Amino acid sequence: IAQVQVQNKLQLAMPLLPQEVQQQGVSVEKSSSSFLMVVGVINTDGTMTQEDISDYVAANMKDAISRTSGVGDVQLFGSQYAMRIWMNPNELNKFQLTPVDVITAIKAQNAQVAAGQLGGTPPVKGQQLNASIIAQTRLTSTEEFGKILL
């Protein structure tokens, strides 16, 4: 209950938060103060980095140890990956572009967009043939993000 209440009065401030701080996601938990246990993840092959060993864990194991009943909190000892676009301010300056530009680009060029259907949801006269119209999908590599058009 307590949790239910906290979250319910929180919910009233939710629309008053900075768009950014919503985007991150607020969180409400009922956890013990202190760690029950810490689960370690190593690579013997030396084949992976810290960099990877985190991201693996996050993508591949965190999510469910989280949804596992009795786990009120999970701390990740690292970060899962993200598409990183380390801007360069001179480089940006030469071609006469701000970070705003970069952003607007990434936004519209890395999208996933419902373009409806061939079969029409309501149709005509009498028609066979019905298929999904598939517009843009989300870029999914360093390589693709790179090829953006500024």
Which parts of 59-118 interact with ligand ERY (CB under 6 A)? none
CA–CA separation, 1 and 61 (whole Å)? 29
- The C-alpha atoms of residue 10 and residue 28 are separated, in whole angstroms, by 9
Q: Which of residues 89-108 bind its own copies (CB under 8 A)?
A: 108
* Residues 2-14 as b or e (16 or more Cβ within 10 Å = b): eeeeeeeeeeeee
Q: Is 27 in the site for ligand ERY (CB under 6 A)?
A: no
Q: Which does 96 bind (CB under 5 to 8 A by kind): its own copies, ligand ERY, none?
A: none
Tokens representing 13 are 């401030």
Name which of 36 and 83 has its Cβ closer to ligand ERY: 36
Which of 22, 79, 93, 142 binds its own copies (CB under 8 A)? It is 22
The only residue of 35, 88, 114, 128 in contact with ligand ERY, by rule CB under 6 A: 35
Number of residues that bind ligand ERY (CB under 6 A): 3
Q: Half-sphere exposure of 119 toward its Cβ, with a 13 Å CA cutoff?
A: 6
